PDB file of C-alpha atoms in Angstrom:
ATOM      1  CA  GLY A   1      13.174   5.910  64.472  1.00 28.96           C
ATOM      2  CA  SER A   2      13.902   9.697  64.854  1.00 26.76           C
ATOM      3  CA  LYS A   3      10.343  10.910  64.559  1.00 23.38           C
ATOM      4  CA  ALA A   4      11.416  14.210  65.693  1.00 21.18           C
ATOM      5  CA  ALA A   5      14.018  14.611  63.416  1.00 18.15           C
ATOM      6  CA  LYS A   6      12.402  13.222  60.272  1.00 13.68           C
ATOM      7  CA  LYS A   7       9.655  15.987  59.989  1.00 10.62           C
ATOM      8  CA  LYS A   8      12.412  18.906  60.382  1.00 11.89           C
ATOM      9  CA  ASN A   9      14.781  17.253  58.238  1.00 11.46           C
ATOM     10  CA  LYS A  10      12.519  15.846  55.529  1.00  9.70           C
ATOM     11  CA  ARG A  11      11.441  19.219  54.683  1.00  9.18           C
ATOM     12  CA  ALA A  12      14.652  20.799  55.483  1.00  7.56           C
ATOM     13  CA  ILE A  13      16.486  18.968  52.599  1.00  9.24           C
ATOM     14  CA  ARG A  14      13.861  20.576  50.264  1.00 10.73           C
ATOM     15  CA  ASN A  15      14.333  23.782  51.956  1.00 12.43           C
ATOM     16  CA  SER A  16      17.882  23.930  50.873  1.00 12.41           C
ATOM     17  CA  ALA A  17      16.848  24.598  46.965  1.00 13.88           C
ATOM     18  CA  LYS A  18      15.314  27.945  48.653  1.00 17.27           C
ATOM     19  CA  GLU A  19      17.904  28.575  50.959  1.00 16.56           C
ATOM     20  CA  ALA A  20      20.634  27.749  48.653  1.00 16.42           C
ATOM     21  CA  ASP A  21      18.801  29.516  45.450  1.00 19.18           C
ATOM     22  CA  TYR A  22      17.409  27.411  42.557  1.00 17.37           C
ATOM     23  CA  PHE A  23      20.831  27.729  41.088  1.00 17.05           C
ATOM     24  CA  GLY A  24      19.759  29.915  38.288  1.00 16.36           C
ATOM     25  CA  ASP A  25      17.193  26.795  37.611  1.00 16.79           C
ATOM     26  CA  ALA A  26      14.199  28.848  38.975  1.00 16.93           C
ATOM     27  CA  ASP A  27      11.738  28.372  35.800  1.00 14.75           C
ATOM     28  CA  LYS A  28      12.043  24.556  36.834  1.00 17.02           C
ATOM     29  CA  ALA A  29      11.688  25.179  40.560  1.00 17.43           C
ATOM     30  CA  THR A  30       8.679  22.911  40.885  1.00 17.57           C
ATOM     31  CA  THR A  31      10.644  20.025  38.860  1.00 14.93           C
ATOM     32  CA  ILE A  32      13.445  20.895  41.428  1.00 14.49           C
ATOM     33  CA  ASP A  33      11.636  20.993  44.603  1.00 14.15           C
ATOM     34  CA  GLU A  34       9.768  17.557  43.648  1.00 12.60           C
ATOM     35  CA  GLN A  35      12.790  15.970  42.806  1.00 14.41           C
ATOM     36  CA  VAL A  36      14.218  16.711  46.199  1.00 16.48           C
ATOM     37  CA  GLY A  37      10.930  15.338  47.529  1.00 13.89           C
ATOM     38  CA  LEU A  38      11.784  12.009  45.436  1.00 15.40           C
ATOM     39  CA  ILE A  39      15.209  12.469  47.222  1.00 15.98           C
ATOM     40  CA  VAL A  40      13.751  12.744  50.913  1.00 16.12           C
ATOM     41  CA  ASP A  41      11.430  10.026  50.548  1.00 16.61           C
ATOM     42  CA  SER A  42      13.621   7.642  49.291  1.00 17.72           C
ATOM     43  CA  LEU A  43      15.991   8.535  51.977  1.00 18.50           C
ATOM     44  CA  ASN A  44      15.899   7.105  55.564  1.00 17.91           C
ATOM     45  CA  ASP A  45      16.090   8.900  58.924  1.00 15.90           C
ATOM     46  CA  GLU A  46      19.952   9.027  59.335  1.00 18.18           C
ATOM     47  CA  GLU A  47      20.575   9.999  55.697  1.00 17.09           C
ATOM     48  CA  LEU A  48      17.562  12.816  55.945  1.00 15.15           C
ATOM     49  CA  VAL A  49      19.868  14.217  58.856  1.00 13.75           C
ATOM     50  CA  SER A  50      23.215  13.080  57.409  1.00 10.14           C
ATOM     51  CA  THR A  51      22.713  15.335  54.008  1.00  4.80           C
ATOM     52  CA  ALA A  52      20.906  18.112  56.508  1.00  4.97           C
ATOM     53  CA  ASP A  53      24.364  18.326  58.474  1.00  4.89           C
ATOM     54  CA  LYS A  54      26.195  19.041  55.244  1.00  5.77           C
ATOM     55  CA  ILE A  55      23.447  21.333  53.947  1.00  6.73           C
ATOM     56  CA  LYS A  56      24.029  23.832  57.111  1.00  7.21           C
ATOM     57  CA  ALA A  57      27.728  23.351  56.748  1.00  7.96           C
ATOM     58  CA  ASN A  58      27.638  24.839  53.095  1.00  9.30           C
ATOM     59  CA  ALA A  59      24.233  26.563  52.978  1.00 11.55           C
ATOM     60  CA  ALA A  60      25.507  28.371  49.876  1.00 10.92           C
ATOM     61  CA  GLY A  61      26.747  25.176  47.911  1.00 12.58           C
ATOM     62  CA  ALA A  62      23.105  22.681  49.005  1.00 10.24           C
ATOM     63  CA  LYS A  63      23.019  21.390  45.542  1.00  8.35           C
ATOM     64  CA  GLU A  64      26.413  19.476  46.327  1.00  6.36           C
ATOM     65  CA  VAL A  65      24.573  17.420  48.981  1.00 11.85           C
ATOM     66  CA  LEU A  66      20.910  16.909  46.920  1.00  8.85           C
ATOM     67  CA  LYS A  67      23.442  15.898  43.706  1.00 11.61           C
ATOM     68  CA  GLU A  68      25.001  13.532  46.173  1.00 11.77           C
ATOM     69  CA  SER A  69      21.976  11.985  47.390  1.00 13.56           C
ATOM     70  CA  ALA A  70      20.388  11.930  43.836  1.00 10.61           C
ATOM     71  CA  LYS A  71      23.343  10.245  42.971  1.00  8.36           C
ATOM     72  CA  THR A  72      23.134   7.673  45.888  1.00  8.75           C
ATOM     73  CA  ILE A  73      19.397   6.885  45.268  1.00  8.16           C
ATOM     74  CA  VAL A  74      20.184   6.000  41.785  1.00  6.93           C
ATOM     75  CA  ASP A  75      23.453   4.196  43.139  1.00  6.56           C
ATOM     76  CA  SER A  76      20.810   1.728  45.057  1.00  7.53           C
ATOM     77  CA  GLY A  77      18.475   1.970  42.446  1.00  5.57           C
ATOM     78  CA  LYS A  78      15.692   3.530  44.002  1.00  2.80           C
ATOM     79  CA  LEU A  79      14.803   6.127  41.788  1.00  5.35           C
ATOM     80  CA  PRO A  80      16.079   6.037  37.907  1.00  7.46           C
ATOM     81  CA  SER A  81      18.349   8.970  36.994  1.00  6.83           C
ATOM     82  CA  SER A  82      15.555  10.177  35.038  1.00  5.89           C
ATOM     83  CA  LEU A  83      13.310  11.039  38.067  1.00  8.99           C
ATOM     84  CA  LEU A  84      16.117  13.228  39.683  1.00 10.12           C
ATOM     85  CA  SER A  85      17.288  14.367  36.068  1.00 12.01           C
ATOM     86  CA  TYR A  86      18.351  18.091  37.449  1.00 13.72           C
ATOM     87  CA  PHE A  87      20.664  17.085  40.056  1.00 13.06           C
ATOM     88  CA  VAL A  88      22.123  13.502  38.685  1.00 14.26           C
TER      89      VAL A  88
END
């Protein structure tokens, strides 16, 4: 229920691919950003901030957090690994 944080964090998680670079996979930038969006939408308020926080702790390796989220989402069975195929 952190309505103010949700809006910021939701996009912030996705901005990580910008801020931490597309990791050399800039050709699939669109795919990458979409997957991160599916990540943020399948997560909740607390997860958004939790992962985001880690991203600010390591801006250079935001992917580590995105991969963590991705695997966690696949783990719970929210999203198939195929949808997050870049990180997972």
